[PDB]
Amino acid sequence: VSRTRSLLLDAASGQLRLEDGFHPDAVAWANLTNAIRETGWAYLDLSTNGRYNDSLQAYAAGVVEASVSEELIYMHWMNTVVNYCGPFEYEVGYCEKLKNFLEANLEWMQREMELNPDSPYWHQVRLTLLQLKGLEDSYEGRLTFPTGRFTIKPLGFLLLQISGDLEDLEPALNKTCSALIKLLPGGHDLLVAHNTWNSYQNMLRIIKKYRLQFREGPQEEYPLVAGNNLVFSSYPGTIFSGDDFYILGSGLVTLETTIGNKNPALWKYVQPQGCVLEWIRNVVANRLALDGATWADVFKRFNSGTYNNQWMIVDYKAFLPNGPSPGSRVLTILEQIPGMVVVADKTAELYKTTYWASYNIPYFETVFNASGLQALVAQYGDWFSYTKNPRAKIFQRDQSLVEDMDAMVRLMRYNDFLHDPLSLCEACNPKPNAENAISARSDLNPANGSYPFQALHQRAHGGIDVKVTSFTLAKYMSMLAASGPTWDQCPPFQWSKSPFHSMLHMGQPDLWMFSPIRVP
Amino acid sequence: VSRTRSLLLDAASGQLRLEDGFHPDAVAWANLTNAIRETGWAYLDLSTNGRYNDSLQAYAAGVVEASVSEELIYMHWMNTVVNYCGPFEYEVGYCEKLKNFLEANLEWMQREMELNPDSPYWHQVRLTLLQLKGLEDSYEGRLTFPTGRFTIKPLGFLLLQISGDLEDLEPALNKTCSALIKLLPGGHDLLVAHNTWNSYQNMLRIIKKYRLQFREGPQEEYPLVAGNNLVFSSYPGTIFSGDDFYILGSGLVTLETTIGNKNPALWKYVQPQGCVLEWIRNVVANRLALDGATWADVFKRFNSGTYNNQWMIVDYKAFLPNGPSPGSRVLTILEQIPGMVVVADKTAELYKTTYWASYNIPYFETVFNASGLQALVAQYGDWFSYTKNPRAKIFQRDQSLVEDMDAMVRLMRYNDFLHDPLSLCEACNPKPNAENAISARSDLNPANGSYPFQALHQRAHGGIDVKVTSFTLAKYMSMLAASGPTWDQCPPFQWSKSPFHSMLHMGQPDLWMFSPIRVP
Numbered sequence A, B: 001v002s003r004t005r006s007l008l009l010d011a012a013s014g015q016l017r018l019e020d021g022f023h024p025d026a027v028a029w030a031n032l033t034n035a036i037r038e039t040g041w042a043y044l045d046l047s048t049n050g051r052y053n054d055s056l057q058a059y060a061a062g063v064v065e066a067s068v069s070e071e072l073i074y075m076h077w078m079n080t081v082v083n084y085c086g087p088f089e090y091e092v093g094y095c096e097k098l099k100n101f102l103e104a105n106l107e108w109m110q111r112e113m114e115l116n117p118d119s120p121y122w123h124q125v126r127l128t129l130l131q132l133k134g135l136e137d138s139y140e141g142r143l144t145f146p147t148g149r150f151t152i153k154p155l156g157f158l159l160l161q162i163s164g165d166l167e168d169l170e171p172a173l174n175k176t177c178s179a180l181i182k183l184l185p186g187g188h189d190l191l192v193a194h195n196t197w198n199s200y201q202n203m204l205r206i207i208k209k210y211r212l213q214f215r216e217g218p219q220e221e222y223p224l225v226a227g228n229n230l231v232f233s234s235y236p237g238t239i240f241s242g243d244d245f246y247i248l249g250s251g252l253v254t255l256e257t258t259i260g261n262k263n264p265a266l267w268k269y270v271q272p273q274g275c276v277l278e279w280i281r282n283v284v285a286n287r288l289a290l291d292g293a294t295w296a297d298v299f300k301r302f303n304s305g306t307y308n309n310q311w312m313i314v315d316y317k318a319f320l321p322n323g324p325s326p327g328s329r330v331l332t333i334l335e336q337i338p339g340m341v342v343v344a345d346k347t348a349e350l351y352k353t354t355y356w357a358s359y360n361i362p363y364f365e366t367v368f369n370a371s372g373l374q375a376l377v378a379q380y381g382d383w384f385s386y387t388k389n390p391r392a393k394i395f396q397r398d399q400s401l402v403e404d405m406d407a408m409v410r411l412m413r414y415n416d417f418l419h420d421p422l423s424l425c426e427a428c429n430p431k432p433n434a435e436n437a438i439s440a441r442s443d444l445n446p447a448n449g450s451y452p453f454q455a456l457h458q459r460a461h462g463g464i465d466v467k468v469t470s471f472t473l474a475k476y477m478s479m480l481a482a483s484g485p486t487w488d489q490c491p492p493f494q495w496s497k498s499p500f501h502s503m504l505h506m507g508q509p510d511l512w513m514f515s516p517i518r519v520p
Ligand SMILES: *[C@@H]1O[C@H](CO)[C@@H](O[C@@H]2O[C@H](CO)[C@@H](O)[C@H](O)[C@H]2NC(C)=O)[C@H](O)[C@H]1NC(C)=O
Pocket: A009, A014, A015, A016, A053, A055, A056, A145, A146, A147
């Protein structure tokens, strides 16, 4: 149930070695409590020692993480990526192109680091990759700390980091989530919630708390980064959120929903050189940012045009409980497609409407238009429209009923597709559709149903969690979290009693009926 | 449940293509009926067309086999070999040595074929490897017939063929079954039974019937091989038995139990050049043999010292029902260790004692002594002795009670370890041990038991089937077959109600309570 490990540097050796238990003298230590049977979550607590340089800390952080979560990593790999571009892959094809792309990209980053040893930016990127290298090395049982260049394998643990990036890399290489930010009445509080939609096979979950001692640049005279403390929802072997939902010790909450790209003329902006993958840009921005504007400035450098998201950056340092609109700084919105990033401060809009909802469609009209959504509105109607899609419509009618944390959870878990008129798809047979909800349950659509596009089909996919925080909760690096598909008004998901009983789901509860829990 | 495919050659193309259904004009066709839910067996029926050359036939036979069993192959790979020398393997080490060994061996065979285009022997080896190449190509969805040299990947579908060979290759590269042949009273019949002991994760089973049109040598003027028709117990993706148990259309039944090698001074005889892996030697001998003597002559060429077995070759053509001992030809015994193969005709001995039992210990004293079993007898006693081990003792007391086919099944499924004095291990606590039986049930030994060596421990391993044939049944290419661990006097094995519920067993029944069936 619980496991603690520390990575020590033996100065006389000078070899890195793992020891069981807590050793404050170590480079890093981690502690995992698996409570998946009881709550649907595991919990990871990890620390690095600032008496060592931040490069050794990063490597050690990956090492001790892998060390306490080996079984979970094994099962997650088996559930999610074991067949991806495997030995027997038919598309031979796409896989060689993918592997060439990733090797060129990894090699491009290694070259930039060696050409720029004094760059704060490339220092942050190197820390991130050292952590990835530590994680893989540890899992394989053989530790080797690199002082210069190192090789990340394209299809090893990197594959756990790039699942979001692969959504765009697949079409670019020619292969054949709900969020709500709610200002409570009288400005009493500011609530921030996110509900990740994913495949049911991905539901091995870890909430991770990192306490690092990284510096902004490659010399010890640089200040400690603003984002050394963070809590985020995550997965085994994944050294960032993926959801995404982070509470940062710099006073920021960062979260996104995915927008993607439907314009094939934009794929030419996805290149192996001059592009840093989204997961790294996300990690680097989270570390360096003091505020929304700085987060956006850092994140949009070397835009890969992969894992194209709408990001919301909430800066709780600019929020005064009971206060009037400060005019700026509270909410920053960023949208990314290939070749284009649009950023705006949306504080005034948040104070005006009292909320900001996000649901997989870009808010910025230039981004909406550039990514090909007009043609989809024209072909299929309001489902692709920003203001008139079902989720937008449910948020419009129900957001004001969120008056507290539990009400937020209720809306974020909302799915009553059999009875809600906003869940009716006129082109579909049957008309009610379980996709048309705050928390989707695609498993509940009939397999012989008639649907106009793929998103509406029966699938082992839907809302798989909710995380909620507030001004006071974020201050204590804390959230409410519920794991599993929604069961408030829908029958609980159960693997053995579903059309998907045969899918691998190692380590996962059969029945998903968990209630929200306080983390920590 | 049932699927039929044919591989056609379009002469105008001239491309190989798969079509559904039966097309007698095709190069090959196959037909799989999965009855695993009902009986514990699937059934494969495969034919090749003799109007094409035997090289194209062999390739096509692998193609159509993979074609009708893709799902089963996928599940078997996942259950058995998915983690073997994988991307994240710790023993880095052994795996590089294994891969170098197999590549050198495969390359050595390719060179011998190109240096010996007129050799019948190397023609038979090439047919076998073409079948392996067809099977892998088909599964990967891209067919390419080689007219000269070709590359087999070391860790692809080859891994499904060499699990027996790996038992000896592992220790040789420094990595850190019951049978009864029974003469019925008055010589009325001759019964031949085999009960394979294996890991429970291997219990995806296919009984395979091949009807080939191969010739002895590379020119059409050569006669058709003696063993073009065969029925054998097998596994998905495995182009030979593995058990082993074969009924050959040449009048022979071939079966083995594994002896292994415990003498490390003999590993130097396991070399990549000058050694053909046991699975190929087994297939080639089965094809070419007319009698026991010829089978042994062919099989012992290029002895790899891997998958070291005691082979029994029963020649039903030499058996006269009700007749006296013919003095020779009925039973041939062969034993293989690295650097040594001993062969003897054991007809007179069979007629004298009325039976031949086999149980993982060499009969030949020179082989018993050379493979290091004397030191194990001296350290642990009768368990390693040929005449005084538990199975030898049960056969000695009970073999005469086999008076018919059902009685044979009963003895071959025999395990009453809680009550049988012959199942008591004096060095063990508790004393009765579920390994000490005709059909082992290691799952039933207590996990906290005290045992003197590994074989006696709790393990997900034991007797997993029984096949029985007779003079009349073999003539009609037929057998009795029962799938699963024994449940005659032991509680039925059930995955969900065992200490091994977490092990992957995709596609397998949860509960194993199947009775014998007539095949076909
Ligand atoms: C950070 O600290 C580590 C550990 O002290 C340094 O690594 C050593 O570097 C020297 C010379 O480059 C090597 O000979 C040692 O083998 C290294 N030790 C280990 C444990 O690998 C490292 O140089 C420091 N700085 C950076 C940027 O990594």
